[PDB]
Amino acid sequence: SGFRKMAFPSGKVEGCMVQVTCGTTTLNGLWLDDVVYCPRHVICTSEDMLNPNYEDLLIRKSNHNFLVQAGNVQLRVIGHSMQNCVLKLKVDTANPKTPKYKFVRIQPGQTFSVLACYNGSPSGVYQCAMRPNFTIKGSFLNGSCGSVGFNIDYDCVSFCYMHHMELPTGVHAGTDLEGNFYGPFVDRQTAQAAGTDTTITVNVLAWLYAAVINGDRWFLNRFTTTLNDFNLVAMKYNYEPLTQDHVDILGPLSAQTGIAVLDMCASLKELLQNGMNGRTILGSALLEDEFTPFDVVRQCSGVTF
Amino acid sequence: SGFRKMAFPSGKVEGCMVQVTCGTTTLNGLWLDDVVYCPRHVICTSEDMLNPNYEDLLIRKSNHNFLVQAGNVQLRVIGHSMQNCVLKLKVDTANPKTPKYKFVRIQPGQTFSVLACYNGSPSGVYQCAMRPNFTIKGSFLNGSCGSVGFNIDYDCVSFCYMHHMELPTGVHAGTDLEGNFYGPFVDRQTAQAAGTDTTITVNVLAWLYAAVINGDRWFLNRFTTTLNDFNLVAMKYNYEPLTQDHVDILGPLSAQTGIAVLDMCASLKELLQNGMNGRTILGSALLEDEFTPFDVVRQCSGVTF
Numbered sequence: 103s104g105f106r107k108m109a110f111p112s113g114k115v116e117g118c119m120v121q122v123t124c125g126t127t128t129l130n131g132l133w134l135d136d137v138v139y140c141p142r143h144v145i146c147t148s149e150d151m152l153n154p155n156y157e158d159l160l161i162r163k164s165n166h167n168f169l170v171q172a173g174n175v176q177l178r179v180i181g182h183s184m185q186n187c188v189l190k191l192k193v194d195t196a197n198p199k200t201p202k203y204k205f206v207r208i209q210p211g212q213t214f215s216v217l218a219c220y221n222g223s224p225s226g227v228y229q230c231a232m233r234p235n236f237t238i239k240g241s242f243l244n245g246s247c248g249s250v251g252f253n254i255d256y257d258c259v260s261f262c263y264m265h266h267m268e269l270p271t272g273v274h275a276g277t278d279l280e281g282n283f284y285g286p287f288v289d290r291q292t293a294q295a296a297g298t299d300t301t302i303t304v305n306v307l308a309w310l311y312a313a314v315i316n317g318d319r320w321f322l323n324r325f326t327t328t329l330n331d332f333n334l335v336a337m338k339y340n341y342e343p344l345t346q347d348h349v350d351i352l353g354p355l356s357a358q359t360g361i362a363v364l365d366m367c368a369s370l371k372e373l374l375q376n377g378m379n380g381r382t383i384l385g386s387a388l389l390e391d392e393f394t395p396f397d398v399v400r401q402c403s404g405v406t407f
Numbered sequence: 408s409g410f411r412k413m414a415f416p417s418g419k420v421e422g423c424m425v426q427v428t429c430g431t432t433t434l435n436g437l438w439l440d441d442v443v444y445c446p447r448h449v450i451c452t453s454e455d456m457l458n459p460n461y462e463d464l465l466i467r468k469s470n471h472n473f474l475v476q477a478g479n480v481q482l483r484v485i486g487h488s489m490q491n492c493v494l495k496l497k498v499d500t501a502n503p504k505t506p507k508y509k510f511v512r513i514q515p516g517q518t519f520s521v522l523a524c525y526n527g528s529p530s531g532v533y534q535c536a537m538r539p540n541f542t543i544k545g546s547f548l549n550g551s552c553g554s555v556g557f558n559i560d561y562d563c564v565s566f567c568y569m570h571h572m573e574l575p576t577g578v579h580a581g582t583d584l585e586g587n588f589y590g591p592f593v594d595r596q597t598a599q600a601a602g603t604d605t606t607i608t609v610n611v612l613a614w615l616y617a618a619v620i621n622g623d624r625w626f627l628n629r630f631t632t633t634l635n636d637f638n639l640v641a642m643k644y645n646y647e648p649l650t651q652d653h654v655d656i657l658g659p660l661s662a663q664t665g666i667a668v669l670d671m672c673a674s675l676k677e678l679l680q681n682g683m684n685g686r687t688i689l690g691s692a693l694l695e696d697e698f699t700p701f702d703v704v705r706q707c708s709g710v711t712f
């Protein structure tokens with residue numbers, strides 16, 4: 103009973119967070135085995151930020167210029183290299199708290215948990231979706247860079263995001279753990295802007311299924327639609343076109359509730375065209391798109407890690 | 408930049424979760440030092456739930472009838488006692504992962520993080536407020552009882568809630584760690600109903616301050632009001648009466664933004680009377696009341712634990 107934006111338990115990730123300082127700049131790093139991963143802009147001063155030449159900046163940096171701290175204890179940096187927008191700092195001690203892990207480049211529309219950190223210490227945990235325009239809606243301040251996004255599957259942590267920047271619309275951009283940005287963003291202080299914030303249609307539908315399971319049924323109508331006719335209406339509202347793959351992904355929720363996906367599309371079409379009329383669905387007055395079909399199944403089935 | 412419903416890092420609480428089984432019923436327990444705390448209804452079968460006599464039920468229970476499991480390893484129960492609606496199971500091993508802790512009975516209007524568990528294993532983390540009507544808006548299924556609510560202050564975990572029940576409106580009820588329910592709820596399968604869901608006025612105001620700090624300023628008007636005139640309008644909307652203590656608690660946010668609390672009340676009064684007109688504040692189309700002035704300060708100042 104009840105449906106909330108739920109983050110994964112952060113314990114396994116908390117044991118990996120370290121503080122990385124280079125000169126005056128301090129940010130977070132992720133310590134897995136004998137390597138610490140962190141944003142490469144840790145080597146920049148405020149002046150450098152406008153048009154940095156990271157390769158040039160890095161020649162003036164040796165292993166000893168990187169101060170790595172895990173709690174109150176200093177790690178010894180024995181090597182360093184830049185891979186795309188991240189630095190990999192080889193340290194002399196394997197993290198004893200390293201969980202079972204993998205690095206994953208996540209698809210737009212998928213969700214993950216962010217463990218927001220400052221000075222290598224955890225501050226909070228919240229769920230995010232990698233939006234179609236490759237931004238996330240987070241909560242990050244100066245010093246948050248290096249904070250990571252992850253998913254847990256049983257005992258294995260899949261890290262998928264490292265925080266690097268904010269955009270003018272108050273949204274956030276960052277990289278996978280290989281240092282490659284999601285979207286067209288670059289790690290420099292330039293004029294960059296998020297494209298159209300397209301809505302994750304399959305996730306709105308999954309959330310409509312979670313509402314039905316949790317007793318909210320007012321929006322169910324007596325109509326149905328086709329994929330092509332629904333997409334004509336959803337193009338107007340900047341919704342992602344729904345495909346047969348999306349319908350198959352919603353298969354289990356549709357079977358659990360007895361509501362065909364195209365019947366849920368017709369209900370969603372009525373909600374887009376007519377609005378909620380002051381009503382709420384799972385405590386919200388807007389259509390929510392940051393729950394995947396798996397998030398709904400997980401939460402409504404009590405999946406543990 | 409950005410403002411999200413943020414839970415505390417759950418790592419310190421994850422190391423305390425255990426599975427408690429008694430007969431066919433399995434639920435969660437909290438293992439701190441050599442004691443495991445769990446809901447007393449773990450001793451009930453489905454039949455017992457309608458009108459249980461917990462003292463009578465407990466005479467047929469010995470230490471060996473309580474199976475306690477921390478991960479894949481069984482703990483040995485050397486004593487048991489009932490304190491209000493919780494059982495305290497003395498075990499032969501102190502939890503090596505016991506953090507610095509305290510038990511706190513939280514005031515209505517305050518917030519905490521819930522670590523939802525099933526079979527003693529963590530499933531997810533989310534923020535809740537202890538509402539004025541003494542219910543919480545959580546996400547809990549069968550087997551979730553014994554899951555706890557907490558706050559972290561530096562290294563000290565203050566546990567304030569243990570989950571026991573769901574109410575007909577899809578909201579949740581439970582106890583402090585001394586076994587005393589918040590509100591008038593009882594641990595039996597009877598007709599119980601939440602009273603009027605009063606809105607936490609001081610928290611809506613704190614959230615309005617977070618919106619201003621994060622760039623959302625459309626709702627700021629050219630009006631002011633008095634405590635007495637604001638409360639006349641807010642009584643109609645089932646809002647908690649605002650007091651001088653609440654105004655003093657909002658003092659630091661008012662000073663940080665330069666917006667007097669009574670000017671923010673006038674803006675809130677216009678929002679209650681006229682609505683949002685399809686606009687949003689921090690991504691929401693409703694007035695949010697589950698952020699305390701401290702939650703806003705914490706998030707906007709980057710407080711770590």
Ligand SMILES: *C(=O)[C@H](C[C@@H]1CCNC1=O)NC(=O)[C@@H]1[C@H]2CCC[C@H]2CN1C(=O)CCc1cc(F)cc(F)c1
Nearest residue numbers: 143242243244245246247266267268269270289290291
């Ligand atoms: C790293 O901790 C930090 C996180 C930022 C700070 C505030 N919120 C947030 O998420 N990242 C930065 O400050 C980055 C650094 C690294 C690469 C370039 C430099 C600039 N920047 C950033 O976030 C861009 C700031 C900016 C925002 C905007 F709206 C217009 C701009 F022209 C620049």
Ligand SMILES: *C(=O)[C@H](C[C@@H]1CCNC1=O)NC(=O)[C@@H]1[C@H]2CCC[C@H]2CN1C(=O)CCc1cc(F)cc(F)c1
Nearest residue numbers: 448547548549550551552571572573574575594595596
């Ligand atoms: C413990 O795991 C469980 C958690 C519940 C189950 C579903 N969601 C949730 O939060 N608690 C219970 O199931 C309790 C047990 C313990 C004391 C009595 C017994 C009944 N109950 C409960 O939640 C009440 C269920 C109920 C709901 C309702 F709307 C009307 C009713 F008459 C009873």
